[PDB]
Design a protein around this nucleic acid. Structure first.
Ligand code: NAD
Ligand code: K
Ligand code: K
Ligand code: MG
Ligand code: MG
Ligand code: MG
Ligand code: MG
Ligand code: MG
Lengths: 309, 255, 123, 33, 56, 56, 248, 30
RNA sequence: UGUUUGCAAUUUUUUAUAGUAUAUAUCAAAUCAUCUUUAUGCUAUUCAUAGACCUUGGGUACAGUAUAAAAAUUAUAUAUGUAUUAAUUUACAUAUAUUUUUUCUAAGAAAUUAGGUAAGAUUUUGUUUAUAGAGAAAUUAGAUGUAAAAAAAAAAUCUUAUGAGGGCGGAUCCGCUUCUAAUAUUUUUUUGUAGUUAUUAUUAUAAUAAUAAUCAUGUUUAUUACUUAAAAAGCUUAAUGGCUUAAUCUUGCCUUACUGUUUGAUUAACAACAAAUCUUA
């Protein structure tokens, strides 16, 4: 076939698997020792810039997926058991639970323009500025139906601690930054106050907390520890409030300081933190959902109980 | 162990290590990763034979059968042909030695794969800087209404590579330059080279006129040719020189 | 204070100047990783195309059943489209008790428990 | 390291040659200045 | 345009007030044309109209 | 000149987590422990196992 | 490939993660510290138990990849090491426990249960890695529990009632919704009446099917996988329910 | 620096070997 | 021997060879502080070697399931027991400072620094939703939609052209001028709207038709382009105008916040002049 002739004849992917006699003679450690010399360096000595200086600057930065890059993160080390569960059992249950049938040839829905125009015969109308969002000042996102092309999922999680008393005892912030480090496995970013309140002794623009964000698998593994090891151990816990939700598919709730020390990562070395310095955190679960009821349905599928509030 | 084998590291690594093809190195992940791409390339090659035979059926099909006639039959083979060209590139885009061959400059430009990476490399950097020269120097709309380059052209004067839009000395630009061209589509074509000076000052009428400093036509070019010396355009390489190279100049005072 | 110094020493090790440098691969070493990276993303594609194929097949099964159900008349005197209009109701789907927690709580594990399944469960 | 020593000597010679040329020209500049 | 936003003439010509919807949808510009009968904005595909401004 | 930030990540281990039902799975954590036996978890809680009578 | 890839990325992490500070988890000169140091010495300094022996620094850091046929990257060798490192090696007073007097930790349960070996199709702990389907025999054709829909009840209310009749009430189950996931239509014979069967999806969490005193003329039951169904069920009955299937 | 540590170590090794040799002979004579 | 140790992989240049300008190698610089003792030490085992369990020692190990064969190796002062010397010479050990390896007290935890230039980011205010401690008032997370396989063709309406050096009156000057080209316009005349995966129907695994999905060879935290009223925030300071495609913000390198003279203006600055303001070479 002429099409097959245009393919590379010297295909390395069609070669046989290596043999054993050669594998028994392949000893990368014996080569170094026997050589008794340093192999000459290669003339290709390009190293990623430490600053991106523009699209057309002679030296360019490689993509993050390049191992030699400065922002390369080793790939997945394991499959989170909550991501394989959701995809294997719960992905279809949500799809079957929330499914509305569309007739075969239903005409496509034309989305209405939310910034209305002034339309009429009056001369002034023509060049009037578009009308304001009817109702609320900011436009709320519209809800998407749960179909086989849109199944809610967890995207990221942001854990944050606000320690106002750290403006007097600077040791409370150092401890908080180490807890959020072991709890999530990342390097938190310190945050600063924004308002001035004398009654609460709050001063603006001074470091009074930290935050962390975990994406991908680390977000699923953080939920497995929370749902199945931490929350069951909280004394007299009722559940996540039914009012949680920002109206866009994100769930938020907070943990007490005595519930943050129940984390397996914080309890093992509980004696290395000063007494009464372990803080409480705010957990904001960000999902791909587009509604408050889609988010609470997603969490219910992961085994999170809710209570009336 | 001579310079014909490569660099010092290669000639050194080629005498202190064992003789074994790169793809046959006994590494676990590299051999498990090369088996996934192996049985996938067989699935792409198995798809090119399924789409290749699917065109014959459509080729040997009376146009009357198609509710759209010959208009709907040529737009269906059009998508099938374009789907096969993409499969021929996806069958070797994961090959480790195809990437090594192309990076070493030893790539066969008569195959769709190598022409795909060569174009993907040109667009990455050289295209961006040339797209800027056409705009900032107002080549468009002065010379052409709109112009989007589709091939690479690197000109060097007396061996020295000159950057695009670089003020060169009048002695340097006294001999015909050498064009290091590169085309990214298949087939052989005839090329026409034209060097135009767009700022010749006309003092009598208070405006600028254009002057041709070189013109040639009927220059065959395939994606395997790289260098073209404008000096021997009718002696060595086939072509018709309408106007030989005129040494660029600029009278004192003018921009 | 001595306990706090241990905390600071942990951050000191994470400082940008202390952390290891970016990798430095040779050609063959780099090429080897290039195939591992190229194969992993292809493996993810196969898993994605398969995962999405089943979701489409399942969804097409419902549309075929619901579309057929939408045309059926019955049972008996009931008018056309009754069972369909009743199946599409979402009563309790977005409430608190929508999904049983006993089902969702259980997640997949690498190895089973002492009792893989409980057959003695009584209502 | 039999043949590699020859290549290393070629690598050492090339560097030692430049180190000599750089010092043979750095002295010249110090005379013009 | 000057430091105080004062618009100045860079060439000898005739003032023109116009609007270019291609460059910016809601801006109005001031240009200077060499020929009084020219109309701005010039079509984006037409060659630049320029004057030598030199003496031999 | 946008700075290219590098990831500052602590040392992470692979851990075996054994629940109260004898089920074990592997995870990625910062603690150095190798096996985490959980005496109280969702498999032994009444809020997650409302139908279980032993826990009632 | 997934096992090899994990082991690969796990070692690249050794070259990019900050070093491990034992002083943050173990207090010096304690039973825990002494235990860590002894086991760390056997691992040749590597604080990780699942990457073999590898030094991210030094002259031999480039040799990070493992060769073909290596047992190191397998999940069996990984668990073996993670379990051989959980046994306390130092008594509470700081003395190393004798090699023979060390208590091994309870090992995990095998993935294949007794039912998998016995092949009992009436057990729910069989094929723990695959989905099982309840197939019932009627006094004979194998099928799923079905029944005629009365005028008062709907599809979901009818399916729940039939399931408790045919299979008993000793099973904890959830009807995933009200939407039918598949349908099988037997055309009418012009005569005989056609049958339009609408299937609803159900999930079982505990219990076992009980066919005693069932209203419908049911004889046997068996929990089959997706591959065993096509050999048991008819071709036209199977082709209509195979779209509802899952990956595993 | 590394080769320096090496040479100094190899040099010290010879001193240690000379000491072990000299003392060994003295022990037998006694 | 700078640059990761298995092999011509970034840009330009130097030199040399073949070659008649090209080709290869080589060199330098830019980008980046990757850490480099091939073992001299350690570990296990064994053997002497005291004899009531001691120092120092000699072997042995054969390494892809890599290995004992380096998970991180320095110096120097004092002084102690063993032990040696021409000697506080040498070896050993521990008593303990002291230094080197930058590798262990978070500046990527701190400061509202305001100009030049380049790149990148582009609603930051308020309102509103939710959120341990937390309340009227503390922090954090949010708050528009669309597009991304690919079109071709016929005539007509202008407008432009340093297009055909068009034609005709007075090549490129000018008002008339046909033709072609480009953008725009027409509701205009339309044609096509696949392929791929799967479904259903008929036909004999394939073909055909309909229906649904479809930016994706790519580290899903995707990305890219476009869009998201007005006010408000920010821009040395009140107010007005303006900026969001930069005049704001962030970062890199800088100090044209330069010397001399000078152009044309502010319908000939302030209804004169002068001190002024913008701008050119
Ligand atoms: N990313 C793409 O190239 C691409 C292409 C087409 C569509 N999509 C869209 O992406 C969305 C779903 O995400 P996705 O499919 O791109 O990514 P994904 O869910 O498959 O991968 C997400 C994360 O899971 C990890 N992961 C995946 N498989 C793993 C395994 N077997 N073991 C361990 N870790 C594993 C990945 O490395 C990554 O960290 C859908 O909307 C899909 O249509 C993505
Ligand atoms: K995937
Ligand atoms: K600046
Ligand atoms: Mg707005
Ligand atoms: Mg705000
Ligand atoms: Mg409150
Ligand atoms: Mg400013
Ligand atoms: Mg005046």
């Amino acid at each position: 076939i002429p099409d097959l002739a245009e393919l590379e004849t010297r295909s390395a992917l069609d070669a046989p698997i290596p043999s054993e006699e050669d594998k028994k003679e392949f000893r990368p450690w014996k080569r170094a020792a026997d050589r008794k010399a340093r192999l000459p360096s290669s003339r290709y000595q390009y190293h990623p810039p430490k600053y991106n200086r523009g699209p057309l600057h002679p030296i360019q930065s490689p993509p993050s997926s390049d191992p030699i890059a400065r922002d390369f993160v080793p790939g997945p080390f394991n499959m989170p058991r909550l991501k394989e569960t959701f995809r294997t059992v719960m992905a279809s249950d949500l799809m079957t639970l929330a499914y509305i049938h569309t007739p075969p040839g239903t005409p496509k829905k034309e989305p209405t323009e939310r910034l209305r125009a002034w339309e009429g015969d009056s001369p002034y109308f023509a060049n009037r500025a578009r009308r304001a969002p009817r109702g609320a000042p900011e436009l709320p996102i519209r809800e998407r139906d749960i179909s086989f092309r849109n199944i809610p999922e967890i995207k990221e999680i942001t854990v944050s601690t606000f320690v106002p008393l750290g403006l007097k005892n600077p040791d409370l912030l150092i401890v908080a930054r180490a807890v959020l480090l072991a709890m999530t496995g990342t390097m938190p970013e310190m945050t600063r106050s924004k308002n001035n309140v004398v009654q609460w002794q709050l001063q603006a623009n001074k470091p009074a907390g930290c935050k962390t964000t975990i994406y991908g698998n680390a977000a699923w593994e953080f939920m497995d520890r929370l749902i199945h090891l931490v929350l069951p151990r909280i004394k007299d816990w009722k559940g996540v409030p039914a009012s949680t939700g920002d109206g866009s598919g994100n769930v938020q709730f907070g943990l007490n300081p005595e519930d943050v020390q129940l984390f397996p990562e914080v309890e093992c070395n509980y004696d290395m933190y000063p007494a009464k310095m372990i803080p409480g955190c705010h957990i904001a679960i960000k999902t791909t959902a587009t509604s408050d009821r889609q988010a609470k349905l997603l969490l219910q599928s992961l085994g999170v109980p809710f209570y009336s509030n | 162990g001579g310079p014909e084998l490569g660099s010092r590291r290669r000639r050194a690594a080629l005498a202190t290590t064992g003789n074994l093809p790169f793809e046959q190195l006994p590494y676990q992940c590299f051999q498990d990763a090369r088996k996934i791409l192996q049985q996938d390339r067989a699935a792409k090659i198995a798809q090119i034979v399924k789409e290749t035979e699917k065109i014959k059926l459509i080729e040997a099909r009376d146009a009357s059968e198609f509710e759209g006639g010959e208009a709907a039959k040529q737009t269906r083979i059009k998508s099938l042909r374009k789907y096969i060209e993409e499969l021929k590139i996806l069958a070797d885009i994961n090959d480790p030695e195809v990437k090594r061959r192309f990076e070493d400059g030893r790539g066969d430009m008569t195959k769709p794969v190598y022409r795909f990476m060569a174009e993907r490399r040109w667009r990455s950097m050289d295209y961006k800087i040339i797209a800027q020269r056409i705009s900032q120097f107002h080549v468009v709309p002065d010379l052409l209404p709109a112009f989007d380059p589709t091939m690479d052209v690197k000109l060097s004067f007396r061996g020295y590579q000159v950057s695009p839009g670089a003020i060169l000395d009048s002695r340097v630009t006294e001999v015909a330059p050498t064009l290091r061209m590169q085309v990214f589509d298949k087939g052989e074509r005839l090329l026409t080279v034209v060097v135009i000076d767009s700022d010749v000052p006309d003092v009598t009428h208070d405006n600028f006129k254009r002057r041709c400093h070189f013109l040639a036509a009927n220059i065959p070019w395939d994606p395997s040719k790289t260098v073209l010396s404008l000096r021997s355009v009718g002696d060595r390489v086939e072509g018709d020189v309408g106007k030989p190279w005129l040494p660029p100049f600029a009278q004192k005072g003018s921009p | 204070d001595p306990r706090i110094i241990n905390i600071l020493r942990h951050f000191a090790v994470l400082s940008p100047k202390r952390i290891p440098p970016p990798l430095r691969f040779g050609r063959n070493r780099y090429l080897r990783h290039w195939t591992i990276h190229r194969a992993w993303l292809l493996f993810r594609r196969q898993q994605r195309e398969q995962r999405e194929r089943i979701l489409m097949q399942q969804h097409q099964s419902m549309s075929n059943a619901c579309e057929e159900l939408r045309n059926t008349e019955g049972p008996g005197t009931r008018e056309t489209g009754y069972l369909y209009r009743v199946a599409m109701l979402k009563n309790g789907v977005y409430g608190l008790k929508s999904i049983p927690i006993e089902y969702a709580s259980r997640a997949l594990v690498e190895t089973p428990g002492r009792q893989a399944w409980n057959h003695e469960w009584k209502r | 390291s039999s043949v590699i020593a020859e290549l290393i000597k070629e690598k050492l010679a090339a560097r030692a040659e430049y180190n000599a040329r750089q010092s043979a020209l750095r002295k010249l500049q110090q005379q013009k200045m | 345009m000057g430091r105080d936003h004062t618009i100045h003439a860079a060439v000898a010509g005739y003032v023109k007030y116009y609007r270019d919807p291609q460059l910016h949808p809601d801006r109005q510009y001031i240009g200077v044309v060499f020929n009084r009968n020219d109309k701005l904005p010039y079509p984006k595909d037409a060659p630049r109209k320029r004057k030598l401004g030199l003496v031999a | 000149a946008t700075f290219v930030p590098r990831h500052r990540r602590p040392y992470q281990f692979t851990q075996l987590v054994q629940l109260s039902d004898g089920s074990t799975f592997t995870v990625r954590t910062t603690m150095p422990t190798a096996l985490y036996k959980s005496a109280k978890d969702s498999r032994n809680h009444l809020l997650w196992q409302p139908s279980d009578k032993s826990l009632k | 490939f997934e096992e090899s890839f994990y082991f690969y990325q796990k070692r690249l992490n050794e070259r990019l993660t900050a070093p491990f500070r034992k002083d943050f988890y173990f207090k010096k000169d304690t039973a825990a510290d002494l235990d860590w140091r002894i086991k760390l010495k056997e691992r040749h300094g590597v604080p990780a138990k699942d990457i073999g022996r590898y030094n991210p620094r030094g002259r031999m850091a480039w040799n990070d990849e493992v060769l073909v046929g290596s047992q190191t990257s397998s999940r069996k060798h990984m668990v073996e090491k993670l379990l051989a490192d959980a046994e306390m090696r130092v008594s509470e007073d700081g003395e190393e426990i004798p090699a023979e007097d060390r208590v091994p930790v309870e090992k995990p349960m095998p993935r294949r249960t007794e039912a998998d070996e016995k092949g009992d199709v009436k057990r729910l702990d069989r094929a723990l890695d695959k989905t099982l389907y309840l197939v019932v025999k009627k006094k004979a054709k194998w099928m799923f529990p079905t029944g005629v829909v009365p005028t008062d009840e709907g599809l979901h209310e009818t399916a729940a009632r039939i399931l408790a009749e045919s299979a008993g009430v000793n099973m904890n189950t959830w009807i995933v919704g009200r939407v039918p996931v598949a349908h099988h239509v037997v055309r009418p014979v012009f005569l005989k009446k056609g049958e339009k069967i609408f299937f609803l999806k159900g999930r079982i969490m505990a219990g076992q099917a009980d066919l005693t005193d069932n209203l419908h003329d049911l004889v046997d039951f068996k929990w089959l996988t997706q591959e065993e169904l096509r050999s048991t069920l008819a071709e036209e009955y199977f082709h209509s329910v195979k779209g509802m299937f899952a990956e595993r | 620096f590394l080769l320096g540590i090496k040479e100094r170590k190899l040099a010290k090794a010879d001193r240690r070997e000379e000491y072990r040799r000299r003392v060994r002979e003295k022990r037998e004579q006694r």
